[PDB]
Each structure stands twice: as C-alpha cells, then as structure tokens.
Amino acid sequence: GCCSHPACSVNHPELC
Amino acid sequence: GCCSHPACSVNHPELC
Amino acid sequence: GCCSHPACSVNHPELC
Amino acid sequence: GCCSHPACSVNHPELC
Amino acid sequence: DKLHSQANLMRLKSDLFNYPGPTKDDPLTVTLGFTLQDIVKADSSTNEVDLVYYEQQRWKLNSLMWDPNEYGNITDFRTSAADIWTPDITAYSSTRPVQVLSPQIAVVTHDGSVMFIPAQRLSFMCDPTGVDSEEGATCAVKFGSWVYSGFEIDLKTDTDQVDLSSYYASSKYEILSATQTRQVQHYSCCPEPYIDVNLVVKFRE
Amino acid sequence: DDDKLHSQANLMRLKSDLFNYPGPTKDDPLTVTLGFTLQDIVKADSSTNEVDLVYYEQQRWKLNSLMWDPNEYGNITDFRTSAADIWTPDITAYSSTRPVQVLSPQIAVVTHDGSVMFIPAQRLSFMCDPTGVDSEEGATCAVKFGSWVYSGFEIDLKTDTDQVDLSSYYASSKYEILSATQTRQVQHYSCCPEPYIDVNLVVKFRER
Amino acid sequence: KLHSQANLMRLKSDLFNRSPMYPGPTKDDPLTVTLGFTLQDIVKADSSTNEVDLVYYEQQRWKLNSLMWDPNEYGNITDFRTSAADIWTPDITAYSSTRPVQVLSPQIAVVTHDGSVMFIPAQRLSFMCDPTGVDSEEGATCAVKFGSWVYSGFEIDLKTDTDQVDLSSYYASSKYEILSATQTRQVQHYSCCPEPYIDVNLVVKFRER
Amino acid sequence: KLHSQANLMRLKSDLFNYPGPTKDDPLTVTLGFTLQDIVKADSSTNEVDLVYYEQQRWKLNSLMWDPNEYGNITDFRTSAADIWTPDITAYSSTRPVQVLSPQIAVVTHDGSVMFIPAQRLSFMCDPTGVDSEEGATCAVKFGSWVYSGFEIDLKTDTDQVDLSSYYASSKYEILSATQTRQVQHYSCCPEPYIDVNLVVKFRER
Amino acid sequence: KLHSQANLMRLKSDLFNYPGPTKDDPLTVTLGFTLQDIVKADSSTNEVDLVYYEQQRWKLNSLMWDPNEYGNITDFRTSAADIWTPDITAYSSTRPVQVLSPQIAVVTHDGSVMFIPAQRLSFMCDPTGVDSEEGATCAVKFGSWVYSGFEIDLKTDTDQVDLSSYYASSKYEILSATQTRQVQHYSCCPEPYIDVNLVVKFRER
Known about the structure:
The complex is a heterononamer, with four copies of chain A and five copies of chain E.
Chain A: H1 6-9
Chain E: H1 2-16, E1 28-43, E2 48-65, E3 76-80, E4 89-91, E5 99-100, E6 105-109, E7 111-116, E8 119-125, E9 137-145, E10 153-156, E11 174-185, E12 194-204
Parallel strand pairs in E: 1-10
Antiparallel strand pairs in E: 1-2, 2-7, 2-8, 3-6, 4-9, 5-8, 6-7, 9-12, 11-12
PDB class: acetylcholine binding protein
Keywords: AChBP, Conotoxin, Nicotinic, acetylcholine binding protein
Assembly: nonameric
C-alpha cells in the first residue's frame, strides 16, 4: 500500500 | 525519424 | 607512424 | 632488499 | 560580434543561474518518453533483464524564461544538466544502479521549457520465461518521482507507443511490443494521487 | 505568479537559515526509527554464502535545530532537500560483504517540527547460508542494522512494526518470502556500561 | 626557467578567466571537430549478448578564437598542456554503447597559440555488435556511430582527415585480426527538419585469428 | 541541549584550527583485527576475500582538551576526512579495498583517536588443502606505506585475532587466526620497518 | 615538537602556494617496477593482470628549500594530489588501472620527489605457451601521454624488474622480468619519444 511506495510513505510519517 | 535522435529531438519540442 | 602515438600526434597537428 | 619495500625505498634515494 | 553572441549567452546563463523544486502551490508537469535501443541481457537465474534506452524528459519553469530581445535574440541554449534543477524520475523495480551512457546536457528555450534526453542502461526485475517461444516474454517497470505525488509533479506521455525506430536490428531479442502508459494510483489512506509511467516490453529471442 | 515567486523566496530563505549540528550526544540523544520494505531477493550464492536483497530502508528522526514556525515563512510546513544537504544517521548493515548500492535518489523531507523522512532504495549483499532454500521449510537468514559509532546513549533505534512490509515483493522472484521480521535488540557487554541497539532483519525464504 | 613558468601561469589564467567565457558553439559561432580513431584491440566479442569491446585512441581536434594568444606577449610560449577538465571539450558520443566508456589514459589537452586544441583519450568501449561469422573467412562486420549529443550540423561540424582507421598499432596477437576499419563522416537528414546531423561511422570487419 | 551543541561546535573548530608523524615526533598506532568472514577462495587465481573490522588507535597531543572548558564533553564523533589518519595498508592485496562501513572516528579528550573501518580485502592466497582436515594457511602483512618504525610504531594489544563475530555459517571454518607484530631490519639501513602479519588457517566447513 | 610541526606546516604552505615540464624546463623521471604477482591470464580475451609497484622519482627546482630556514626539516610526506606528478601511462592496458595503495609522495629539500603507488593492471597479452616449460612472453610499454623526450626524459636505474617480493605461491611462475628504456623516433619529426618496455616471461606453476 502507501507504505511500500517511497513517495507516499515519505509524505505520511504518522501512518508509515 | 527525428524523435529517435537525441540531438534532433531536443531541437524540436514541437514534434517530439 | 607519429599519428598512432598520442604524445607525438598531439605535438604535430600539421601532420595528424 | 630495501628497494622491494615502498616505505624503505622511499626513504633511501641513495640506493633505490 | 561573435564575441557579442558569446557575451550575451554568458550573461544570460549567469543571470538565470543566480528554484527549490515543485510544491502543491507551484506544481510541475513532466513529460516522459522512451526510445528503446536494445535488450542486452535476460538472466533467468536471477530474473533480471538489462535494457538500453533513451529517456526523454521535458518540463517548463517560469523562472527559466527570458526575453530574447534583451539577450541578442538568443532563443535557447545548452547547459550541463548539473547546473539546473532536474526531476527525480526513477525506475521503481531496478536491481542495480542506473548506468548513464551519454553526456547529460539539457536544452533550455526562452519560454522556460527544458528538454533532457540521457541514454541509460537499466537492470530491473523481470521473469523472462517464455522468451524462447513464439509468445515470448513480457516484463514491465514503472517510472515515477521518488518524493513527489501527483499534486507536485504530474507525469505525462505524448504517446503510449515506445519509439522502436532505433531498436538494434541484430539484438539477441526482437521486440513484439513496447508501451509506456500513464498510471494513476490511489491509496485508501490518502487523498492525493501517485503517478507512474509503466513500461511494458513483450520480447523474444 | 507573484505569489509563486514569493513562496519560492520564503523556501530559499527558510533553507538558508536552517542550512547556515555536530551529531547527537549523551546530553542530546536522538531516536531513529527504521522500517524495511523488501522488494526482491535477487541472488542467493551457495558457493560463497552471500545473498543479495533489494529493499527500501525507511529512516525517520527529529532534530530541534530543524524546527521552524510556518508563520514566519509564508506558512511553509515542509520541504524536500537532497539528503547530502542535511545530517543523516550512520545506520549500517553489520554483516554485509559488499558496499551497498544506492538504487534511488537520496532526498529527505523535512517538516516544520524538525522531523525528517528518508527512504533510500538499496541493494545489499550480506552473509547468508541458503541451505534449505530448495525445501518446504526454506532457508533463514539474518542481518543486523544499527549505528556504527554511536551507542544507545546517543542514537536510540526503534521500529513502528515488527513486520517487514512485503506488499511490494516481486511476485515473480526466484524466491518467495515465508516470513520477514525486523526486531529491535538491546545488547550489553561486560566492559562498557552503555547499551548497543540494533534492528535485526530476519528473512525466511525458499525457491518458488 | 622561472620567467617562463610565470609566463605560462599568467597566460593560462588570462585564457581560463576570460570575460566572455566560452559557452560552447552556436549557429552564429559554429565549430568544426575533427575525429580520428587509432584502433588497438578488439578485446572481447560476446555472442550471448551481442556486445563487442573495443580499445582505441580517439583523437579530437577543434579550434577556438577565444583560446588564441600572441606568443610575443607571453615570452614566446607557443603552446601548453592542460587537464582536459580545465577547458571546454566537445560532447562526441558513441550512439550505440552498452556500458559507460572506460578511460584508459590521462585526459590532457594541448592548446596552441592559434587556438587549436588537440585531445586524445584512450578508451574501452562496449557497443551493440553481432559477431556472427567471426569464425569464418568472411568474418564479422560491426559499426558504431559517433556524434554530438545535443548539437546539429549547424553548430558542430564533424570531420575526419582520412576514412582509414589507423591500424598501425593494432595488437598483433589479438584474439581477432582486423580485415578492415573505416571512419566515415555521414550527414543525416530528417524529413521534418531543415538542419542536418553529422556522425562519424566506425565500421570494423574482423575474424578470429 | 543547545548549549551542549554549541560547546561541541566550539570545541571542534578550536580543535580543527598535525602534519603527520616525524622522526622528531614519532607516533604509535595500535592495530587489531576482528575477522568476520572468509567469503571466497579462488584457486584459479590464488586470491581469497576476507571481511573484517580493522581497529586503529593512536593519540595526538594536538587533539587534547579540557572538558570543563567545554561543558564536560569527554569525546566526540567526527568524519575520518576531518582528521589525520594513518596510512596502514595490506601489502599483498590484489584489488582496491572495499569499505563496508561509515568512516567516522571517535576522539577522546586525552587526544586518543579510535577508528574502526569494516573492509573487504582480496589478497594473494593459495588455498590448496582447504578441502582437508589440515586446511589451508594464508598470511597478509599490514603496515605503513611511507613511514618507518622511527616515524610510526605499529603495535598490537594481543596476537589473537578476535573471532567472536566470525560468521557461524561461513563456507570456511577458522582453525586459527593470529596478528603478529614484526620488526624487519634492512641490510643497507638502520631504521626498523614494522608490520602486523595476519595469519589465518582455515578449511571448508 | 610543536615548533617542528609549525615549521613543517609552514614549509608545506609555502611550497604549495609549476605548470609541468617544457622544452625550456625539461624533466627527468626515473621509473622502476617491482613485480608482486601475475594474478590472472585470460586466454579467451588475451588479457593478463599484474600487481606491481611503480616507482617514480623526479626533481623540481621549485620544490627546493634550505633546512635551516625551516627547523632543519630535510624531507616531508604529502598526498600525491598536493603536488604535480608525471603522466606515465601503460600504453596497452585494457582496463583502467586500479590503485592498491595510498598515494603519498616524499619530497626532499633538494627538490627530489619519490612516489611509489601499488597498482593492478590488465593489459594485452596472448598467454599461449603458458602451459609449457618455455612459458609465455608478454610486454607492455609505459611512457608519458603528452610529453616527448624533450620535456620528459624517462630512464631506468637497472633493466632488472625487482622480483625479490614476487608471490611464491602465485598461479604463475615468473621466468624473467625486464624493464628496458626504449627511444623511438618517427621520420616526420625530430623529437624522440621514450618508453620503458616491461617484458615478463612466465608459465603455470
């Protein structure tokens, strides 16, 4: 999901 | 044609 | 000749 | 001898 | 006056070079296109395939525009890609560092548009099962920004056909098809989209 | 457009103030959070007992010296910067057999509270015996990650989860993952009173 | 000796710190690059990937007015050696390499008072090549084009002084003997577009020795 | 915390504001090895690859300070580039050393430096007999590249190589591993030349 | 002692704050090889790999100094990147040279410099005959890349390549190794071109 996508993860610390 | 030649492509944004 | 040797070639533009 | 050793050789221009 | 053309160009370049990347308020469109030169190697013991291609990249910055009238009618110039900002477009499934096969030089035009076409060799994850058959093997790799979502960098292609007109005619592998397709990804956690260009190559020995 | 140039000036001004930190100290300790996204086991060499992994290594940490008030900088809440423009932690695999290969840009995201997010993609060769990889039970290998020169008194290590993210594992790899875990560990030695933290990456895998 | 060294350093400072610096060539100020190959060895021919590895010297010559000086003003200095990194050099590129080029020699250019630059790096190149036939009397034929990466014929003109690759230093006990090697200027025209594009085509025919 | 930081930055530029050892001011360097793995033994070229930690310790008076002047700082971490480091070299490597670890040193207020790079080393080794109970034996000497014993004095704190981290599933088991100071005197010349000889006896597991 | 260091740091500062040789200011470079190992002989490509020390010595008047103006300092060590070094090059390598040691030079108060880097070199060599008792013979020339004999005079002190440290358990037994100064002239031109020709005879052990 988001957390394995480096562009998504890096934008959502609280989540990933 | 032109798009596949990098020296030509960079001179013709309008086509490539 | 001189033109296959890089020190000699760079020293004789008139020939190489 | 000394010339085989880079640290020795470099100290003795005399023989190496 | 040939010195005056050089003077105008040096003046313009130092002027422009003296931009932090895109933000949600100032987003950027990057257009991407591939010219596939060669499938060099398909390794079935590690499932890696090695590709040689040109990656055409184009985008436009208002901070790079200028009036040719103020600069001796200079309408464009060449510059080392290292002196300007460049997008972080990356293969997502590579298995080795990209190797650059060409100079890295961009062309800036007076309206602020930039073109940059580096040649590259890429190893990436690919199972070449079927490459010894009529059907062939199919493999795919996504390219996209590494730190920017669709709200900061929008990714686009001018066509979904990979340019195969310079494909090496005596390659060990012939190309059956090659497409470059924009994908928009949505995660349920997150309102912003993520954009990639999927490169799909069908090939056989 | 005038507003767009104004935001660019705020940002340049913000970076300039921040970019113009000697590392953590016992008096000012630092917490680094690690997580791994495993993408592929590329190679498993039985003749040398080395294994090659491709992964993302997510690193988060927080510095008070990177803090800023968004109000004083045009309401900017965060920015991207080259990882080479800020301090980064020296997190290192302890049993690699080759220099790590970088597979991505190295760009960090800094938030106004001082938080930094940094996710390099990497390829790692490390010591691993793949005996059993051709059986139902599979093979098991392990590698520790942690600071090279800081004890737990200066850099503390954490995970947000013990599960290695496998949702992007290469579905047509030569190897499927049976399990992958990432476990914080605290070690103490005879001599030295300070603890040593690492994160142990344990992967169990077999031929597909 | 010290007077000449001082003259050399003041000359190099003057040239390298010129006020209109050299931004590369333009349509208004084009440039001619002369190219010659000295082929030393075909190291490897790999029929599992169709790559072939060449070792050669690539001689490059060009001339800039902004590198001209009067020798009488600089203690009769007629030329100097300088690291290639300290001057502009052209962006001439193999168009079908499969690996980054490896440099096998120092990268040092000779600049003469008339503004001529000469630069001969030794290189090892991997490029696309089908070696089929290399084990026959006819041998194998392979070709690689060299040219500018970003400049048309209207900014960089490419020339050779001879179409004959220099084989006088070819390695006599190579795994492959050379049957012929030519270097030929070629003009590419594209329908869309008026300006031409120049390459030099290196064609090598060879067989197992 | 900001004051402690400012103390450290003050310390470093005071400290950062030594040209190497001399016959007037010799230096003692202590070497220790932690052998982690024997990766590979190539009998086709007689090369063997070791992974190890190389511990290096020395002390400089120019690096000593008073902790009270700097807020009770006892030690600091710094980039190995920021300080002088010794030129200790494997004498029979066949490939450039590959560095597996950050290159950061710890300086302590007495002026002592500790530096522990992890390395992979190819070196000249005939591994004949590695498939026998007797095993194989190989040695590589380490020492300064340009300094004699009168300028750098090489010492060990033990002649036992640390095997407590040796990879338990290595393809090769260690039978023994010693690190032994050697002083060599040359016919021509008075000065001693000093090396630490790493000897490793090993066999297939 | 700190006075010795201040004298030396000052001396290095003064010297480091020369454009290469010229026809008016020519330079003599003495070359000597120490052959440590023939690592590998590839008969599929006709490449051979050597590990050797390349000993280089030259003397510049601009590096002179009086010890009495500098605390009786007679010599110092410095990074080889801090000084001018000659462009001596293998003429028939097939791979970029690999450096196996520090690159540190020793400068003496008379202006003479000594520099001995360890290197691995792949070069063109047909190893046919290596599996016989007569063995194989191969040769590689070293010489300046851009200087004629009028600017850089190359010379040897002996034609014997030092084999006293050759690796006794190498895959290849060395039968001879010579380093001969060659002077070459081309009919076109008056100036000489000088190389040192390294000839090694060897066979499988």
